[model samples]
Target: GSSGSSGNMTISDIQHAPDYALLSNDEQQLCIQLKILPKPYLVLKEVMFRELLKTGGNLSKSACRELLNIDPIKANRIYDFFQSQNWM
Candidate 1:
């Protein structure tokens, strides 16, 4: 067996738009820790937070690059973190 990065699926294939407005700051962040991401806690002024709001909590890898200034791998990790909490 071998490991490979196949172009088998895209984030859109698995992701659904989440209701960011339905969640509170406690549920958005304080409830869990995103160890994979380099930063901690988000504020309203942060574009990352704004983007998430605009996307309705469906922050994609491309948006992470274009808006959050994070790399693709880290972007997916952020998505993964949210996924773990069933928030993304």
Candidate 2:
């Protein structure tokens, strides 16, 4: 069921029991816990963060990585990571 290629991560890493226990009754049920290893598809997101955090953050993913030598796959994975945390 697992396509081991990127790295290692467990459910507890993403969804901790203490954290879950601390959640409010309603929030606990609605919370989304994502569990997955890192991949090389976050290039898209690294570019976005750079743009938003630096130089007024106007550059697109392709433009930022292409111009800055960032890998597209890795960028995409980074994007996915932030997305898991509801960063937008």
Candidate 3:
């Protein structure tokens, strides 16, 4: 009942800090609606990841959580859900 995947392997398909951010407001909204997470946090996460995309340094988890005002458990849960095949 489990699939093998690591944290990094889980979101390989997601292009964080997508080019869509530079799109017109209406077009950006459309992509956001169609993306994995439509909420603001996803936008922030992707933006942050995009800025640090090519860097070897790790992204700041605490900053992201603070920006989203989410607890650690909630953040982990979000990542876990994406890794899982179950419905949220």
Candidate 4:
């Protein structure tokens, strides 16, 4: 998935964040398999940017809830990850 050009998203942004290290072993393997970083970050980033375009970068809880519906476990993991990053 990441093999293709990322458009406005930078590989360096994913590389530099602490998100990757926060993933579980299986999650890391999934990233490798998908050629993307821990999946929630990408989903969150997509929703974040979409809302950014709409609301000048302010994200809504509704947006997060909508996007994270793909995987409840990963969404909870992301919540944990955010706590570690002091993002909550």
What does candidate 4's lDDT look like per residue over 11-71, in tens digits? Answer: 5545455578876565555455434565455666466456657776454454555655545
- 9-58, model 1: which lDDT tens digit per residue? 33332222133334355444522332211122233225655676786877
For model 4 the TM-score comes to 0.35
Better of 2 and 3 by TM-score: 3
Estimate TM-scores for all models: 0.37, 0.29, 0.30, 0.35
Candidates in order have lDDT scores of 0.44, 0.45, 0.43, 0.53
Selected candidate, larger lDDT, 2 vs 3: 2
Clashing pairs in 3: none
Cα-based lDDT at residue 10, candidate 3 = 22
TM-score comparison, 3 vs 4, better candidate: 4
Flag the better candidate by lDDT, 2 or 4. 4
Give the C-alpha lDDT of model 2. Answer: 0.45
lDDT of 1: 0.44
Model 1 TM-score (2 dp): 0.37
Best by TM-score: 1
